[PDB]
Amino acid sequence: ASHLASIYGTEQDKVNCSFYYKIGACRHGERCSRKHVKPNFSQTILCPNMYKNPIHEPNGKKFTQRELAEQFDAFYEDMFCEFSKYGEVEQLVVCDNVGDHLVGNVYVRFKYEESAQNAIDDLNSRWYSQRPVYAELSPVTDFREACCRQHETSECQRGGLCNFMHAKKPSPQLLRDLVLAQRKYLALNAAEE
Amino acid sequence: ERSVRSIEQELEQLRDVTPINQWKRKRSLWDIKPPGYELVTADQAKMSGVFPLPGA
RNA sequence: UAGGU
Ligand SMILES: [Zn+2]
Ligand SMILES: [Zn+2]
16 A cells, blocks of 8 residues: 556556567567557667577587587677777677567667667667668666566576567676776776866 | 776776777677678668568 | 566
């Protein structure tokens, strides 16, 4: 009785699409019967189909577990470094799903909303791996509410077609080196004043 | 002011770390265009329909 | 138009 109950953003909210509100991507896309409110201000950006997992191509299964780990680290490093030039990157999430709406999705949460807007304004005129990058503001805020639970512990029985994020995590060595590298870069852009 | 105090404090503990803007990136796939698209901008390529998202 | 409040 401490507060009023609500249903906004939930699967009981039959007007707004719960999946687009939490995951930033819906299998129905622009033809969805439920509302996809696209934010004008956000800290998180979306680059759909940015990560092409080699295992989903010809000769994909020609790689060792070490080679696949070094390859994804190269991609996560290539993503984090380039996005850092727009602002402080709080979190970088890469989706390993196979559904059309989530395959290779790269979400980037910046610290300031202006850094996110400057990113999509510049990215939408750039290229990555011989493909033009699509960039837009995403309503995703808490990635815990968008990730699949049964994929964290063991594997999800829905597989790559899960409508929740199957985030591919990079090596902890690379993630730690990236956070320390960004703090130094941000500290160095502070001694100027 | 403790701002310049904490800044030089953070910098000194991160002496053996490279800033992110310096990091040598071998095989960076950014700004790489497919053959023949040197004069096509990313906006013109998306509107051409040759590069659709998997949803479409 | 769902499995996730
Ligand atoms: Zn939807
Ligand atoms: Zn799942």
